[PDB]
Amino acid sequence: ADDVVDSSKSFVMENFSSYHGTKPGYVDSIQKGIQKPKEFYSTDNKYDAAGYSVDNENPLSGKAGGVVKVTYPGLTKVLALKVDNAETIKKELGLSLTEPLMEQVGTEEFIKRFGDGASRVVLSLPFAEGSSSVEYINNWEQAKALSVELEINFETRGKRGQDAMYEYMAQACALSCINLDWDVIRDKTKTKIESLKEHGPIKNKMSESPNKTVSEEKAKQYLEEFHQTALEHPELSELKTVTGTNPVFAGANYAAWAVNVAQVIDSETADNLEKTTAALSILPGIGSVMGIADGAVHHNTEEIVAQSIALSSLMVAQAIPLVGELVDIGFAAYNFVESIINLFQVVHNSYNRPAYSPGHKTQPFLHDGYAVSWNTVEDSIIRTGFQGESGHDIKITAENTPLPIAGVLLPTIPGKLDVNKSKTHISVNGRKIRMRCRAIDGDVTFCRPKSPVYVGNGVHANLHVAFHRSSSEKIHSNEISSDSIGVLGYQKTHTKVNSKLSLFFEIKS
Amino acid sequence: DDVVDSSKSFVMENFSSYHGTKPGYVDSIQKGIQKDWKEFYSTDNKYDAAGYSVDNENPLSGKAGGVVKVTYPGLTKVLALKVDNAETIKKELGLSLTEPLMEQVGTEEFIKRFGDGASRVVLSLPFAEGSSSVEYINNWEQAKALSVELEINFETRGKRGQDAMYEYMAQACASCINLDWDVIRDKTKTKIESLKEHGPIKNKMSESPNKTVSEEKAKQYLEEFHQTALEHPELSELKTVTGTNPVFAGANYAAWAVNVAQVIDSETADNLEKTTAALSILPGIGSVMGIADGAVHHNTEEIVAQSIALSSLMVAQAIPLVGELVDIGFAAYNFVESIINLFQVVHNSYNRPAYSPGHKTQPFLHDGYAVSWNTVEDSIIRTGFQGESGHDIKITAENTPLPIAGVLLPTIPGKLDVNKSKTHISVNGRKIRMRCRAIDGDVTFCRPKSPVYVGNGVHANLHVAFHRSSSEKIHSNEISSDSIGVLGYQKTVDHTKVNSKLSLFFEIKS
């Protein structure tokens, strides 16, 4: 009982409501009543619900139906479960091992012992890893008592692609919130493509093209030339400025991408938005077109996005005869734009959703071939407000060849926070190695291993950092300058700089 | 009162353990063990104890003492602890909060209450993550009863550097890398010698700037020297084994050599400890060691000697071009001694049991992606019962958005089917359902119904769910692959489509 039901998350409430994403065509009909076509699903977050509203026949690019709100009259008990294993659930709550779960949850017998005087019971679960959303499981028979309201119908807006669905989800965050007007982007994209077809210098570059199936390498050099020529045009002004220094946004990457697109798109694929999206979605290098690198979305204005898509479009049109099997170049301006637009929206949605950055909690920090992470969530928390010790474990390894760990930088506080020298150590494939710790200043201590440490494929390390607290005083924000522990990798030189591997921590009671 | 692990606690007659001893104390400590965690440490593994035997003043390159075995007469209680926080240990067991733990552990009140009849109690802790060894903590007063015996004295053997210590630690696995470093040392000199006093090699050794020159130009010349040097008969084996793998290219030997010449000054070259400390923080050493893709390729005395020799000569050439060392004896002196120590450290790590990438919670790093089983239990597929199981996989990537095309899953009719309704993937919390369809009778491929991209700031949790219709246990000879294949981006090699494969290895258990 207490081993599968989370009482703290269980509760009673009058007019319990939740949301249900609905496919195209069922938005008006479901309003007449919740009917079985083993459970009826709903969620507490109307935005997560919108993500289930896409046409099941065209899941990647199809149209989105809508979201409806379902409300149970009277009192409803929400029963939170710690596990989603039915047989396990049954063996604990002393239920009929033979009879289905959601079958018993709808019977009065179950409602009395678990409902707390409520008219019915609805099961609850964590919506997903990395989500604070809740997923509800409703009995079909009890669900028949739900009154249904229209929360929103995406089709009636009359927008293109899945624009309505994504503009809706973007409301959750309205760093920063990416809330782009894709109508304007679609409009600006078309306008720019057009301007870039009938021009002086750009039209000249098109006539200086092989226009025949050629090797990748030759296809790429011409494309880079095209990219450079094209980028000097006034309408790609801003793009030229924002793509000039970050290697990831270089012409060579726009060409690699364009070549790749031409290679995998044939006539049948070009003629279908769903199949095009499928093909493009598994390609590498898309971050170059989206201007997404180093954990941030750099292309976040309608103007710059339309310029990048227009430039990639034009380029794909060029890479087609040189690399593709396709004969109809129309694909570059039609489905390629439609498909890539969708992909942009997916990635933007992802950056808009709360998530831990590398080195925070158990999200690994990947850098220079190394992978480091806090072993457990509690490890990333430095508790305060007490005298005594604590231990914090950090996992460390590398992708291939032996890369060294020179040591670690740890925060200190003259008076309170101190590094416990004897308990701080690092182990390599189980070999325990002690460390030599010395203050580099009042607030930072550097610990170096007393034996050489290397990690790589097949060789991992556990860095165990231990802290000593002299007083029960709480660590205030100002006291600790940095917010991360710095593991140091290899040294590279005319100045010495170490590979910085960061693990971010939180200060709590 | 859950700070003691009774399952691992026991009483034993003549409880013995091992203690690593520093140089000069091997003989003396045998006369007897003498003085919050003031303790006398010992361990159940004499090889791990050998690792604490290195001179405190020169811990990187210094000499090793030896290992001694300590035995308590009569019966002894080994109390296994679940935590190393003394304060917690005091509060839970209901002891005084003001007096030091190890002081209290050696008293009769404690010895009667927890000793289960023993004459004294010894505390026990897990040695460390990735280790199955045990660390013992002894009360100094009680430790006076320990009889001390010699297991091995490393200096008595009279070997060079830390050879005796590493030869001894290598007995544990004696695939085991068990190299004879005397032979390797002797062959290194012989090879360095032949390579300096030769015809063809000295011809290239003459066409040198021999003056502080550009770093790029230093490399170029070194790559040619490497190219030329590698044609000598004494480096024939190395020529062949370093021929195709890019990690072992002359360019890497050059990058390595240049890096060495840049960080060694006369003071450093004159002190092995300082040389090791300087060299131990440089990248690219796997080029010289021949270590890549999870294996030690240079595992014969001959080939190891050639690589070090070749590296020594290159460092000798790199110095004038980039370094400021008026002397060049370093390349043949402390450079060889220090790099030898580093080969030994890395070899020892590959000799120790450890989980490979994609096993247990060790991540699998490849093509910018990083994937791992969420917990150790997730990597275990239980069999021998009708029912469902869930398995969570963490997925992310280093920088730009890379896609996840799907996942290849093993299937066994009745004993292991994919539960299509509960199999899904979440990206920064957005739950995405999957379309699962068999490729063949043994493998099922699940594609996400919404495009999936991971990268810096975007992670995914792939939740694989299995259904078992039969109670019959899955037998070993019934699954072809022991891994779950997560698929990343697709690439067209020439005109052939291949997927970036990310593997999570699982174990079948009852």
Numbering used by the authors:
A (entry chain A): 2 to 38, 51 to 187, 199 to 517, 520 to 535
B (entry chain B): 3 to 37, 49 to 187, 200 to 535
The authors write:
CRM197 protein is a nontoxic variant of diphtheria toxin (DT, molecular weight: ~58 kDa) with a single mutation (Glycine to Glutamate substitution at position 52) that eliminates its toxicity. CRM197 is synthesized as a single chain holoprotein, which comprises two domains fragment A (catalytic domain) and fragment B (transmembrane domain), bound together by a disulfide bridge.
To verify if the rCRM197 produced from insoluble inclusion body protein have the overall similar 3D structure of the protein, we determined the X-ray crystal structure of rCRM197. The four chains interact as dimers (chains A–B and chains C–D) by domain swapping, with each monomer in ‘open’ conformation, a typical packing that has already been described for both DT and CRM197. The overall fold of the monomer rCRM197 is equivalent to C7-CRM197, with an overall RMSD of 0.34 Å for 451 out of 498 superimposed Cα atoms. The dimers in the crystal structure of rCRM197 and C7-CRM197, are equivalent. This confirms the structural basis of lack of toxicity in rCRM197. In conclusion, rCRM197 conserves the overall folding, making it structurally equivalent to C7-CRM197, which is used in many licenced conjugate vaccine such as meningitis, pneumococcal conjugate vaccine etc..
